[PDB]
Design an enzyme around this catalytic site. Sequence first.
Site, PDB file in Angstrom:
ATOM      1  N   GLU A 206       0.312  -1.267  -0.100  1.00 47.82           N
ATOM      2  CA  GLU A 206       0.244  -0.345   0.097  1.00 47.82           C
ATOM      3  C   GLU A 206       1.098   0.984   0.139  1.00 47.82           C
ATOM      4  O   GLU A 206       0.992   2.153  -1.087  1.00 47.82           O
ATOM      5  CB  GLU A 206      -0.994  -0.103   1.476  1.00 47.82           C
ATOM      6  CG  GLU A 206      -2.091   1.495   1.202  1.00 47.82           C
ATOM      7  CD  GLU A 206      -2.792   1.937   3.148  1.00 47.82           C
ATOM      8  OE1 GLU A 206      -1.835   1.392   3.503  1.00 47.82           O
ATOM      9  OE2 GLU A 206      -4.096   1.756   2.314  1.00 47.82           O
TER      10      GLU A 206
ATOM     11  N   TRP B  61      -8.194  -2.123  -0.436  1.00 49.89           N
ATOM     12  CA  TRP B  61      -9.128  -0.906  -0.577  1.00 49.89           C
ATOM     13  C   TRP B  61      -9.986  -1.134  -1.699  1.00 49.89           C
ATOM     14  O   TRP B  61     -10.614  -0.525  -2.382  1.00 49.89           O
ATOM     15  CB  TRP B  61      -7.959   0.099  -2.307  1.00 49.89           C
ATOM     16  CG  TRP B  61      -7.531   0.804  -0.604  1.00 49.89           C
ATOM     17  CD1 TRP B  61      -6.246   0.786  -0.050  1.00 49.89           C
ATOM     18  CD2 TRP B  61      -7.400   2.009  -0.521  1.00 49.89           C
ATOM     19  NE1 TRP B  61      -5.811   1.627   0.103  1.00 49.89           N
ATOM     20  CE2 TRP B  61      -6.762   2.846   0.474  1.00 49.89           C
ATOM     21  CE3 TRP B  61      -8.869   3.292  -0.962  1.00 49.89           C
ATOM     22  CZ2 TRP B  61      -6.644   3.969   0.538  1.00 49.89           C
ATOM     23  CZ3 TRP B  61      -8.701   4.045  -0.521  1.00 49.89           C
ATOM     24  CH2 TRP B  61      -7.991   4.661   0.435  1.00 49.89           C
TER      25      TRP B  61
ATOM     26  N   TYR C  35      -4.242   9.064  -1.241  1.00 45.71           N
ATOM     27  CA  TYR C  35      -3.161   9.545  -1.065  1.00 45.71           C
ATOM     28  C   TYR C  35      -2.121   9.831  -1.895  1.00 45.71           C
ATOM     29  O   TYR C  35      -1.964  10.825  -1.834  1.00 45.71           O
ATOM     30  CB  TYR C  35      -2.776   8.434   0.067  1.00 45.71           C
ATOM     31  CG  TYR C  35      -3.979   8.686   1.189  1.00 45.71           C
ATOM     32  CD1 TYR C  35      -3.765   8.809   2.305  1.00 45.71           C
ATOM     33  CD2 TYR C  35      -4.276   7.268   1.520  1.00 45.71           C
ATOM     34  CE1 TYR C  35      -4.591   8.795   3.877  1.00 45.71           C
ATOM     35  CE2 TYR C  35      -5.426   7.109   2.256  1.00 45.71           C
ATOM     36  CZ  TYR C  35      -5.589   7.704   3.071  1.00 45.71           C
ATOM     37  OH  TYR C  35      -6.082   7.807   4.772  1.00 45.71           O
TER      38      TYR C  35
ATOM     39  N   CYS D 184      -8.036   9.349   6.188  1.00 53.59           N
ATOM     40  CA  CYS D 184      -8.196   9.151   7.789  1.00 53.59           C
ATOM     41  C   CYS D 184      -6.843  10.017   8.235  1.00 53.59           C
ATOM     42  O   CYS D 184      -7.124  10.474   8.938  1.00 53.59           O
ATOM     43  CB  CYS D 184      -8.447   7.967   8.014  1.00 53.59           C
ATOM     44  SG  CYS D 184     -10.460   6.287   8.251  1.00 53.59           S
TER      45      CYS D 184
ATOM     46  N   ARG E  19      -7.456  11.142  11.522  1.00 58.51           N
ATOM     47  CA  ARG E  19      -8.817  11.898  12.351  1.00 58.51           C
ATOM     48  C   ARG E  19     -10.297  11.002  12.702  1.00 58.51           C
ATOM     49  O   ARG E  19     -10.571  11.159  13.351  1.00 58.51           O
ATOM     50  CB  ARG E  19      -9.853  12.762  10.652  1.00 58.51           C
ATOM     51  CG  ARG E  19      -9.930  11.561   9.279  1.00 58.51           C
ATOM     52  CD  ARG E  19     -11.885  12.679   8.306  1.00 58.51           C
ATOM     53  NE  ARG E  19     -11.957  11.887   7.546  1.00 58.51           N
ATOM     54  CZ  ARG E  19     -12.317  10.871   7.586  1.00 58.51           C
ATOM     55  NH1 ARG E  19     -13.239  10.984   8.791  1.00 58.51           N
ATOM     56  NH2 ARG E  19     -12.206   9.496   6.859  1.00 58.51           N
TER      57      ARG E  19
ATOM     58  N   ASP F 122     -10.470   3.300  13.280  1.00 58.84           N
ATOM     59  CA  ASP F 122     -10.355   2.481  14.533  1.00 58.84           C
ATOM     60  C   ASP F 122      -9.923   1.590  15.103  1.00 58.84           C
ATOM     61  O   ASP F 122      -8.704   0.712  14.614  1.00 58.84           O
ATOM     62  CB  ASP F 122     -11.223   1.728  12.890  1.00 58.84           C
ATOM     63  CG  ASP F 122     -11.608  -0.245  12.570  1.00 58.84           C
ATOM     64  OD1 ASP F 122     -11.220  -0.317  14.647  1.00 58.84           O
ATOM     65  OD2 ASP F 122     -11.381  -0.789  11.964  1.00 58.84           O
TER      66      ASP F 122
END
Lengths: 529, 521
Positions: free
Chosen positions: A306, A328, A354, A414, A434, A437
Site C-alpha cells: 500500500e 482497498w 493519498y 483518515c 482524524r 478504528d
Amino acid sequence: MMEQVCDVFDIYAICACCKVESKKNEVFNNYTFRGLGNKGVLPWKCISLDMKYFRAVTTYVNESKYEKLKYKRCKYLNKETKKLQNVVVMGRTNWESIPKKFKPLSNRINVILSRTLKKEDFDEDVYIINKVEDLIVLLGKLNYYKCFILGGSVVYQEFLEKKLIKKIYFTRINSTYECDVFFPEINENEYQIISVSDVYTSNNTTLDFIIYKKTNNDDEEEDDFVYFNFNKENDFQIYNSLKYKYHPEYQYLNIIYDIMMNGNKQSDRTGVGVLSKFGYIMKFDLSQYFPLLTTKKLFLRGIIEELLWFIRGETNGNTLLNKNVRIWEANGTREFLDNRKLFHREVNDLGPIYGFQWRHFGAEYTNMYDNYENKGVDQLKNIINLIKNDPTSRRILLCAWNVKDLDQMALPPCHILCQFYVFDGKLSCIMYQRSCDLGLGVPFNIASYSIFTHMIAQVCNLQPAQFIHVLGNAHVYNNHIDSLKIQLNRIPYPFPTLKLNPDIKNIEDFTISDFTIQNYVHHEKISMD
Amino acid sequence: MMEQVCDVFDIYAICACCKVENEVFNNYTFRGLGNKGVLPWKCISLDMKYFRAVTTYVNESKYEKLKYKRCKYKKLQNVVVMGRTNWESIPKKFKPLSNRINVILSRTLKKEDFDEDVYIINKVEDLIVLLGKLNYYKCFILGGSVVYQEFLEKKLIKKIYFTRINSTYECDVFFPEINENEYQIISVSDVYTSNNTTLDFIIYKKTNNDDEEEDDFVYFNFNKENDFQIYNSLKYKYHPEYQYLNIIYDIMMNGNKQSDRTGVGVLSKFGYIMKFDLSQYFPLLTTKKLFLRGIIEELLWFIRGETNGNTLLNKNVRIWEANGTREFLDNRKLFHREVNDLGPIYGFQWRHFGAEYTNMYDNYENKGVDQLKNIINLIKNDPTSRRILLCAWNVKDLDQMALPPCHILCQFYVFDGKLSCIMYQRSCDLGLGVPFNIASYSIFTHMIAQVCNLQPAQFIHVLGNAHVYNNHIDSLKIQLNRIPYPFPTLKLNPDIKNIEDFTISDFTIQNYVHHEKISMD
Ligand SMILES: NC(=O)c1ccc[n+]([C@@H]2O[C@H](COP(=O)([O-])OP(=O)(O)OC[C@H]3O[C@@H](n4cnc5c(N)ncnc54)[C@H](OP(=O)(O)O)[C@@H]3O)[C@@H](O)[C@H]2O)c1
Ligand SMILES: NC(=O)c1ccc[n+]([C@@H]2O[C@H](COP(=O)([O-])OP(=O)(O)OC[C@H]3O[C@@H](n4cnc5c(N)ncnc54)[C@H](OP(=O)(O)O)[C@@H]3O)[C@@H](O)[C@H]2O)c1
Ligand SMILES: CCc1nc(N)nc(N)c1OCCCOc1cccc(-c2c(N)nc(N)nc2CC)c1
Ligand SMILES: CCc1nc(N)nc(N)c1OCCCOc1cccc(-c2c(N)nc(N)nc2CC)c1
Ligand SMILES: O=c1ccn([C@H]2C[C@H](O)[C@@H](COP(=O)(O)O)O2)c(=O)[nH]1
Ligand SMILES: O=c1ccn([C@H]2C[C@H](O)[C@@H](COP(=O)(O)O)O2)c(=O)[nH]1
C-alpha cells in the site's frame, strides 16, 4: 499459619532467557523464552543492558527497609533483636563460567552450591554449601537485604521444585541462539506475571524484563491527595492484575481500555455503533523496537505494498488486487463508487486519494491511467528535500486532506498529515489521524507510519527516532468488543525489529523484498468479529 | 529544640474567600468571608461538598502515630472549631455538624446547653487542653474573621485550606492578610465552575521559622540518565494552567537546542497535547496579563473570509503587520503582491478553499469550498460524522501565502449536546504565541457551539514543533515560578445565532484575575 521460607528470607531468582533453535506458522507462549546457556557459557556474546539490570537488581538495598526484615527473620526463628548487602547464590558450573576478574561478584555476599568442591578449593571470599537446606541456615546467620538465585539450570530447577522462590526476575531476550541448558517450564498455577517493562535494544536484539510473582493460592500530604479527589464521581482480570504495564504496547491497550470503560455510545456512518473518545497521543521509540502489536497476529505485506503504491502516486485499485492485497477492494466496487455519487468512475478507480495527493496535490484528477508527471505539488519530494537541506524547518508536512478533492475520493483520508522533526541526525514523525478504528485499523496504521518513518529516515541519511500517533475520533466498534476483551488480557511480548535494505537511497526505489521483520513473537490471530 | 503546639495537635484553618467591592492582583484579592452576619454568596455547592469531605475525613490506621505524639506531649472523629457568630450563622437542620466534634468558642455562652457533645469554651488556650482530653483525628478552625485573626497571631495553624471564590460580593468581614514569610502555598487544585462562579482550592503550609513492589519500581528505572524554586516547591499542581507551564518546564530541561528560520535559536521538543475543559473555565493564562481584543477581531476577520491586512491595522490590531510589509513579502518572493495583501491564508481557505487567489479586493462570493459553513451544517445535521474538519493547510496555495498557517486544522466532536475541538498546530512559540492560540481557539469553540445550539466541552490543543525562543528563557523562569489564579469565564451575547453575526461587543471576559504583564523580549 506460620508462613514459608521464601517469604521470610526473601529469596528470588533472576535469569535471562533467549529463544531456542528448532526449525512459517509457529506458536508462541511464555515457554518460548527458555534458553539459558550453551557449552558451559551463555548463548550470546554480551547483552550489556541485561548485565546492567542484573547488576542493578542484585546490588540494590534499601537500608530503612532492613529493620522490618530483621524483626521478621528473628521472629520466624524465635529470636530477640560493612554496608548492607544482598546475598547471591550460584551453582558450581555457573560460578566457573564467570571470568576471574568478576569473582566474587562485587558488593554482594557470594554463595556457591557444590558437592565436589569445598572451601579449600577456593581462594575467594565466598561461602561454599553442599545442601540447599544449608543455604537457609546461613540466611538465618547473615545480615542481608535480599537473596537472589543467580542461576544454573540445576539450581533454578531445585529452588522452584522446593518452592523457595518468591519472584522471578526474568529477562526475555528476543533472539535465537544455540542452547543446551534451559530454564524450567514455569507453572501458571504457581506463578503469574505481575510486571512488564519497556522494550529495549541492546547488542542487535530487543529484550524486555518481566516479573513473575508466586500466586495467591511523609504523612500530612497524603491526606491532601484524598481531599483533591473529593469530586470523583471482571472482564479484564488479567489486564488489571498487572502492577507495572510499561511495555509500549500498553499505549494502545490502555486506550481501548479507556474507550471500553469511559467511551461515549454513538451511532456512526457504518450503522454498527461505537464507543468513542476524542484526542489521544501514542509514542513509539523506533530506535528501540518496531512496534508491531504482539497481543494478536499481524502481517505486513499488504500495508507495505500500500505504502509503495502511495509513493508511486497510484490511484489504481487493480494494482493492489493483482498482488492479492485487498485493503482497498471494498472502496472501489461499482456499488461503493455509485453510493459516493461517482457514477462516471471506473471500478477500482479510487480518485485523488493519498498517492495522488502526495505526488500531485492540486492537479485536476481525470482517471487512474492518466500521466500526471509534473502536475500539482510533489509534496513527497518536497518534504525529502526539506529534511535533507532545511532540517530545522517547522513546515515539513505531508498533507492528504485536500478539501477540494474530498468528494472525488472513494472516501476521504483518515490519515490527514505527517509532520517531520529532525534533531542530531535523527528523524521523528507525527501522524494525525482524524478517524481511528481501534480494533482493526490502528494496529496496521501504527505499522505503516513506523515503516514510512524508517524509509524516509534512511533515504535522508538519518536514524529513525519517534513515531508519534495522534488520534482524533478514536472509536471501538461494537462488533469488536468481545474480541478486544480477549486481547486486553494477553501480555505483550518483546517487540520485533524492522530491517531495510541499506542500499536503497531514494524513496521511489523500495520494493517489497527490501523489508524484513525480525523476531516477531506474537499471540494468536484474532478475528475481530 | 522543643517541637510546636500545632505540629502536635494538627490545627488547621479552612475558609472560602471571595473578591470584594487597571487593578493589580495578589493572594490578598481573595479575602471575602462574610456579610450581614451571613455568607457573601447565595450557595456554593462544590465548596460545601469539599468542606464536608475535608473536615469529616479521618484515616483510622494513622491515629496511632498521632496518639503517640499527643500523649508524649469508639468512632474516631475531627475537631471542628467555630466562633459564636458562625455557630449562630448555621440553621439547626445540620447543627451540630454531622460526624464531627462540634466545639463553640464563646466567652459569653451559657455552657449548660445540650452538653453531651457541643463543648463550649471561653478562653483561648482552653481548646488545646480540651484536645488533650479527646480521641480526635485533626482539628479544624472555621470560626470567623476574628476567630481566624487570633489563631493566626497565636501561630496555632499548621495548614490553611483556602477556597478561592472567583467572584465579587458585598462583604463586611475579611480573612486576615496571610504573611508570605510565615505561610506559602504547597498545592493548587483543578479549576471548577459551581453556581455561576469559577473557584479553586489551595493549601498554605507553615514555613519552618507491602514495599515489595516499591523495589520493583526502582528496578524498572535502572536505565534513567534552583531557577525553578517556587515551581518545584509545589506538591500538587492540578490547576490546568500547568499543562502550559509543564511543557515550558519540559522544553527548558530537556529541549533540543536548534537554529531556526529566524536566527534567535530555540529549545524545542516534538508532540504534546493539552486539554482544557471549557464547561468549567476560560483558559486565559493568569501567570501574566493577556489581552483579547486583537485575537477576537482576527477571528472575526477570519470568519468574514478576509485577506486584507489593512482591515486589522485600521482597528489597531497589528498581529499580521510584520507579515504584510514590502520587505517581508519580497523575502517570500511575492514581488507582485500589494503591501498587507496576505494572500490565500486562513480566511480565504475557510470560505474559499480551492478558488484562484487574485488580490485582497476581488470578489470571491460562492467561489471555492466554504468549509466553515460545511462544518456548521455537519455539526447541526450529522453530528456523529468523523469528517468535521476545517483545514487551512492548502498545499497548492502555501507559496502564495505571506506565511503558511501555524494552525493546520480543527476537528470537531459532538456527544450529548456537547462540542469538543482539536486544533493541530505545526509550530508553537511557547512564550508568545501559544497563550493567544489557546484563547483564540477556545473562543472559536464557544462560537461554533453556540450557533449550533451545543455546549462547549473540551478544547484540545496538539503541538507539533514546540519551541521556546532563547530570548524568552528569563521571562519564562519568572513566569514558571508564579502560582496561577482561578481562571476567568467567557460570556457570548446569547442573541447571536449565526457564525457570521458576532461582532466585537458580543464577547465578555469576566473575573479575569492575573499576574503582572511580562515582556517576553
Ligand atoms: N542466562 C541465565 O540467566 C544464566 C544464569 C546462570 C547460569 N547460566 C548458564 O547456565 C549454565 C549452567 O547451568 P547448569 O545447570 O549446567 O549448572 P549449575 O546449575 O550452575 O550448577 C550445577 C552444579 O552446582 C552444584 N549443585 C547444584 N545444586 C546443588 C545442591 N542442592 N547441593 C549441592 N550442590 C549443588 C553441583 O556442583 P558439583 O558438580 O560441584 O557437585 C552441580 O553439578 C551455563 O551455561 C551458564 O553460562 C545462565
Ligand atoms: N467563608 C468562610 O470561610 C466563613 C466561615 C465561617 C463563617 N464565616 C462568616 O464570617 C462571619 C463571622 O465572622 P466574625 O469574626 O465576625 O464572627 P465569628 O468569629 O464567627 O464569631 C465571633 C464570636 O466568637 C466569640 N469569640 C471570638 N474570639 C474569642 C476568644 N478569644 N475567646 C472566646 N470567645 C471568642 C465571641 O463571642 P462572645 O464574646 O459573644 O462569647 C465573638 O463575638 C459571618 O458572617 C459568617 O457568615 C465565613
Ligand atoms: C547474563 C547475565 C544474567 N542476567 C540475568 N537477568 N540473570 C542472570 N542470572 C544472569 O547471569 C548471572 C550468571 C553470570 O554469568 C556470566 C557469565 C560470563 C560473564 C559474566 C560477566 C560479565 N561478562 N561481565 C561482568 N561485568 N560480570 C559478569 C558476571 C555477572 C557473567
Ligand atoms: C462557604 C462554606 C465554607 N467553606 C470553606 N471552605 N470553609 C468554611 N469554613 C466554610 O464555612 C463553614 C461555616 C458554616 O457555614 C455554613 C453556613 C450556612 C449554611 C451552611 C450549610 C448549608 N448551607 N448546607 C448544608 N447542607 N450544610 C451546611 C453546614 C455545614 C454552612
Ligand atoms: O487506515 C485507516 C482507514 C480507515 N480507518 C477507519 C476509521 C473509521 O472507522 C473508518 C472510516 O470511516 P469515516 O471515519 O471515514 O466515517 O475506517 C482506520 O482506522 N484506518
Ligand atoms: O498563531 C501563531 C502564529 C505564529 N506562531 C509562531 C510559531 C513560530 O515560532 C513562528 C512561525 O514560524 P515558522 O514555524 O512558520 O517558521 O510563529 C505561534 O506560536 N502562533
